[PDB]
C-alpha cells in the first residue's frame, strides 16, 4: 500500500523532470554550431614512446607542470616519466599488482593508485630519504577502486565498484564524506576546475553531479544505454562528456541538465575507455577498444582525426594542462605522446 | 646534455635494468584465474596445493601464480591469464543450473575468447555417495538424464558403480556441450573429476597448462 503509492510518486517526479528538461530544450547544439567552420583534419604524430611497462597499462595522469606523468600497469609497477626526455624518474613497486587507477597530485608531491585490493595508496614523492614510500592507505571501500583524483595534498576523491564515491582526509585516513546513490559500479570521476563539484559515471548508464562540500547528488544525467567507462569535465566547468560501451559519447550540460550532443559513428561498434578535452575544449579525444583514438569536434560532432599507434586496447588518455600534448596508454604496455605540426 | 642530464639518464637506465630483472620473473610465471562459487570448495583446492587472494606454487621448476576471487568490469584485468580454473560442486544438483549459467557467461565472455578453461568438477566422492543412496534423482532437475546412456568409450575407475558413471559423465557432458557451442577452437575446456582431499590436483593443472602452452605454439607455427 504505502510502498506502491510511493513508487508511483517517483514516476510522477521522473515525468516532471523529463518535462522540465524538454521545456528548456528550445534548440539543439548541432543547430547552434552549424554556422561555425569545421576544425579541418587533425594530424598528430607520436613524438615520444614510453617503454618499460611489462603489462597492460590501465591509467595515466599528467602532473600540473605538463612535463611529468605517472602511469600504472598490472605488472605491479607505478612509473613516473619525464615526457620531454622519456627518462624514468621513479619506479614505485605496488603491493597489489591489480591497479586500475592512478592520480598525480596538483602540488606534485604525491601520487595515488589502487585497484582490486579495495585500497587507495598514497605515495610521498618528496622525502629526505630519496625514495618513494607509502604515506597512507585509505581503507573503507568494499569494492575495487576505479578512479581517484586529488583535490589538494590532504584531500582526494575516490570512486569504487561498490556503487559509492568517497571524499577522504589523507592526514586522518578517514573518509569525511561518502557519496551514495549510484545503483551500479562507478567506473570514473572527473573534478571540476574549481574543485567544488565532480561528476561520476557508473554502470547504471547514468552520470551524477556531486557537491564536494555539501556531500549530496545535485543532478543526475541519463541517456546512455550501457555502462559509462569515462568522464571528463569541460574546461570551463559548465559541461562534461562521457563514454560508454554503446560506442557513443555524449556531451551533457550542467545548467541545462540534459544531453546536448552525441558523438557516434556507424563504423564504431566498440566500447569507449577514456575521454578528454583539449585546452580550449574544441576537441574531444576518446579511446576505443578497436585499438584507435578518435579526435572529435566537440561543437560539430565531426570525427576530426584518428590516433592509430597501438596494437591493443587504448585504455587511457590525457591532455596536459597547457594543452601542448596528449598521452595515450594502452594494453600493449606502451605510452605515446602526441601533438600536431604546423 | 648537461652534467645533471647525463646523471639523470644514468638513473633512468638503472631503473630499466631493475625493470629487466622483474620482466624475466614475470614472463616465466604462469598466471591462473580461479573462479567458482561459495559451495564449489575452490578455497580447499588451492589450500591443499599450497580483495584478490593470490597463491603461488611451483610444480617441477615451473612457477604457478593463482588468483582466487570471491562482474563484466573487473574481469578485463585477467585478460592475459594462461588458464581459468572453473570449479563446481557436482553433488549439489539444485544449483548445477546456476553453475552452467555462470560457466556459459565466462565461456562466451568477450574478454575471455582466447582463454582456456580448466574445468574442475569438485567433490566427486560426495557425488558418488549421493547417487549411491538414491534419495535424490537427477531426473527431477534434468529430465533429459533419463534418456542418457554411458558411452562404450567411457573409462570408469576400478570398483566403481555403473550408476555413478552414468551420472558422472552426464554432468561432464553438460559443461562440455556448452564449450563446443561456440569459439571455433580458439580455447578448449579441460573437464576433470577432482575431490577436496585429492593430492594430484596440482599435476592436473600442470599437464593441462602444458597442453594450453603447446597449443599456443602450434597456432604460431601453422600461421593460424
Amino acid at each position, epitope marked *: 500500500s504505502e510502498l506502491d503509492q510511493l513508487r508511483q510518486e517517483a514516476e510522477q517526479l521522473k515525468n516532471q523532470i523529463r518535462d522540465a528538461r524538454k521545456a528548456c530544450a528550445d534548440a539543439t547544439l548541432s543547430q547552434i554550431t552549424n554556422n561555425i567552420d569545421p576544425v579541418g583534419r587533425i594530424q598528430m604524430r607520436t613524438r615520444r614512446t614510453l617503454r618499460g611497462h611489462l603489462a597492460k597499462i590501465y591509467a595515466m595522469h599528467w602532473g600540473t607542470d605538463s612535463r611529468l606523468l605517472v602511469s600504472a600497469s598490472q605488472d605491479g609497477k607505478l612509473i613516473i616519466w*619525464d615526457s620531454y626526455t622519456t627518462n624514468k624518474v*621513479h619506479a614505485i613497486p605496488l603491493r597489489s599488482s591489480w591497479v586500475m587507477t592512478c592520480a598525480y597530485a596538483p602540488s606534485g608531491n604525491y601520487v595515488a593508485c589502487g585497484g582490486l585490493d579495495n585500497i587507495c595508496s598514497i605515495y610521498n614523492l618528496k622525502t629526505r630519504e*630519496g625514495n618513494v614510500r607509502v604515506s597512507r592507505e585509505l581503507a573503507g571501500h568494499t569494492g575495487y577502486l576505479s578512479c581517484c583524483r586529488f583535490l589538494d595534498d590532504n584531500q582526494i576523491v575516490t570512486s569504487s565498484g561498490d556503487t559509492t564515491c568517497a571524499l577522504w582526509d589523507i592526514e586522518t585516513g578517514q573518509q569525511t564524506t561518502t557519496f551514495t546513490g549510484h545503483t551500479g559500479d562507478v567506473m570514473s570521476l572527473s573534478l571540476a576546475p574549481d574543485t567544488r563539484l565532480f561528476v561520476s559515471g557508473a554502470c547504471d548508464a547514468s552520470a551524477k553531479l556531486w557537491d564536494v562540500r555539501e556531500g549530496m547528488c545535485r543532478q543526475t544525467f541519463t541517456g546512455h544505454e550501457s555502462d559509462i567507462n569515462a568522464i571528463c569535465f569541460f574546461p570551463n566547468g559548465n559541461a562534461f562528456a562521457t563514454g560508454s560501451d554503446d560506442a557513443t559519447c555524449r556531451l551533457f550540460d550542467l545548467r541545462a541538465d540534459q544531453e546536448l550532443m552525441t558523438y557516434s559513428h556507424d563504423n564504431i561498434i566498440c566500447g569507449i575507455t577514456s575521454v578528454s578535452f583539449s585546452k580550449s575544449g574544441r576537441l574531444l579525444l576518446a579511446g576505443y577498444d578497436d585499438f584507435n583514438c578518435n579526435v572529435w569536434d566537440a561543437l560539430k560532432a565531426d570525427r576530426a582525426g584518428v590516433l592509430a599507434g597501438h596494437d591493443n586496447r587504448v585504455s587511457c588518455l590525457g591532455v596536459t594542462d597547457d594543452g601542448m600534448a596528449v598521452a595515450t596508454g594502452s594494453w600493449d604496455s606502451f605510452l605515446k605522446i602526441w601533438n600536431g605540426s604546423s | 646534455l*648537461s652534467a645533471e642530464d647525463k646523471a639523470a639518464v644514468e*638513473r633512468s637506465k*638503472m631503473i630499466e635494468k631493475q625493470l629487466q630483472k622483474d620482466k624475466q620473473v614475470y614472463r616465466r610465471t604462469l598466471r591462473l584465474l580461479l573462479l567458482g562459487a561459495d559451495n564449489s570448495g575452490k578455497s580447499t583446492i588451492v589450500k591443499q596445493m599450497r580483495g584478490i587472494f593470490e597463491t603461488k606454487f611451483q610444480v617441477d621448476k615451473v612457477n604457478f601464480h593463482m588468483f582466487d576471487v570471491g562482474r563484466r568490469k573487473w574481469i578485463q584485468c585477467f585478460n592475459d591469464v594462461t588458464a581459468i580454473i572453473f570449479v563446481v560442486d557436482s553433488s549439489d544438483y539444485n544449483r548445477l543450473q546456476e553453475a552452467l549459467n555462470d560457466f556459459k557467461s565466462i565461456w562466451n565472455n568477450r574478454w575471455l575468447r582466447t582463454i582456456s578453461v580448466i574445468l574442475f568438477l569438485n567433490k566427486q566422492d560426495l557425488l558418488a555417495e549421493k547417487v549411491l543412496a538414491g534419495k535424490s534423482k537427477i531426473e527431477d532437475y534434468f529430465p533429459e538424464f533419463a534418456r542418457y546412456t554411458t558411452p562404450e568409450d567411457a573409462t570408469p575407475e576400478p570398483g566403481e558403480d555403473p550408476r555413478v558413471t552414468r551420472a558422472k559423465y552426464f554432468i561432464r557432458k553438460e559443461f562440455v556441450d556448452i564449450s563446443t557451442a561456440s569459439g571455433d577452437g580458439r580455447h578448449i575446456c579441460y573437464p576433470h573429476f577432482t575431490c577436496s582431499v585429492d593430492t594430484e590436483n596440482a599435476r592436473r593443472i600442470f599437464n593441462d597448462c602444458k597442453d594450453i602452452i603447446l597449443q599456443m605454439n602450434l597456432r604460431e607455427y601453422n600461421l593460424v
Partner: single-chain antibody
Amino acid sequence: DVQLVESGGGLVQPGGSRKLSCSASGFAFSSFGMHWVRQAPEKGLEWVAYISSGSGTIYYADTVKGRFTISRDDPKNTLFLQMTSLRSEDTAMYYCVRSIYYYGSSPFDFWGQGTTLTVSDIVMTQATSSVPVTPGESVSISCRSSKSLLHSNGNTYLYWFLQRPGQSPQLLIYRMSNLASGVPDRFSGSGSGTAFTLTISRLEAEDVGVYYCMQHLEYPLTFGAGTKLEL
C-alpha cells in the same frame, strides 16, 4: 634522521696514503650520487671527486686525478676515498656530500660533518670577500662566471651554499632560483647568464657565515672564493 659521518682523517706523512670513510644512515644510499669536497684551512671549498649511483660514472679533479680513488659499498652504505702520494697541498677538511639527479631534484642538499686531514674550467668569482651587515637589513651577494651557466634546456646550473662558523655547508639555492627544503623564504636567488645575485631580506644572526656559489654546468665542479657576512 639523515646522517653522514666521516672518519679516517689524521696526521699523515708527506707522500703517504690514507683511507677516508663516509658512513651513511637514514636514507637510501644506493640511490644517491656522492661527492667529496674539501676546504683548505682559511680557504674556500674545492671539489675532489664524484661517484654516481650504481658506480657507473666516476669523476676526479685535475689536481687529484691519478692519486685519489673514490669508491662506494652500497650494501654497507659506506663511501670510501683511497688517497695516495699525499702532499702538503692536500691538508684540508674533507666533506661527504650526497646528491641525487632527476628532474626537479636538489643535488648537494646534505653535507657531512667532515674529517680533518693534516699532512706534515669555469672560473667562479666572488670579488667581495667580506660584507659588514646588521640584523634586519637586506643584503645582496654577487657571483660571476667565466662561462654562461645557462644551458639550452633552460636551466642555469648555479648553486648557493652557506657555511656557518663551525658548521658544514648547507644548500640554499639550487639551479639559481629554487629554494632548498628547510631554508627560510627570506633567501632568494636571482641571476641571468653570467651574473647572479643572492638577496637576503631581513638578515638574522643565523645567516652570519660564508656564502659560496658553485656551478654544476660541467665537471670539474668549481666554487667561488666566498663572501663572508659579519656583524
